[PDB]
């Protein structure tokens, strides 16, 4: 079925946790803008990823009863599973494609004016499809 206290317990951690991960994007922003001094930044994001593997032990039961329910719950949260770790890996593209770039490795401006839009565009998708299916769980209750 739907096990309802579960779920109520889940969707709050998994806001939170979605929430933390756009913090640590905020830290990467300030930092290579240089807004913030590489003291702070390896200090808060290591806080940060504390935050994130105490809320990942504590989601474990919620997230394993939700996931034996299988149908539509389970594909849900698999799809959150997979697009948080999407997401991640568009972030290390943009960061190394900015790095082939400076350094003049790539063959053109417009290749790389087409690429680094591409995956602008990717974090959007990415980021929207998380949140979409972060509503479909809290639907469940409100």
Known sequence: SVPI???????????????????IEKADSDLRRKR????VYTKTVKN???KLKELNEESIPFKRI???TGGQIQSIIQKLDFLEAEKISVKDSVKLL?????????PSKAAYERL????????????????????????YII
């Open 116 to 139: 680094s839009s591409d995956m602008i565009k990717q974090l959007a998708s990415s980021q929207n499809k998380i949140d979409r299916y972060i509503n479909e769980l809290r639907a």
């Open 5 to 23: 206290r579960e779920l109520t317990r889940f969707v709050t951690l998994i806001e939170e946790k979605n929430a933390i991960l756009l913090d």
């Open 48 to 50: 940060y990823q504390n």
């Open 98 to 106: 900015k790095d082939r770039y400076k350094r003049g490795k790539l």
């Open 36 to 39: 913030i001094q590489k003291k």
């Open 66 to 68: 939700l996931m034996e």
